[PDB]
């Protein structure tokens, strides 16, 4: 539940370059696939569950 982003999945470590103002991520099919931790400025990758 990262700052309103309510979703389930496998949070992994991705080498994605996020802009300073960009917080959320998405893809072609309009699905959240990357989030930013509001505590430490790291890059996460929400992936669908198994």
């Amino acid at each position: 539940n990262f700052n309103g982003l309510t979703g389930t999945g496998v949070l992994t470590e991705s080498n994605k370059k996020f802009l300073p103002f960009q917080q959320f991520g998405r893809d072609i099919a309009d699905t959240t696939d990357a989030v930013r931790d509001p505590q430490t400025l790291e890059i996460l990758d929400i992936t669908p569950c198994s």
Partner: protein, 39 residues
């Protein structure tokens, strides 16, 4: 894994290696036998 909804993509039974082997066998039969290997 790019499904997001459960629409799984089933992999084919015969892989690319098996199709390549089948094509190589067909080519070897066409070269050595020509038409008698198919009848």
């Amino acid at each position: 894994a790019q499904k997001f909804n459960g629409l799984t993509v089933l992999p084919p039974l015969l892989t690319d290696e098996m199709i390549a082997q089948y094509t190589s066998a067909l080519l070897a039969g066409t070269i050595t036998s020509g038409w008698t290997f198919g009848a």
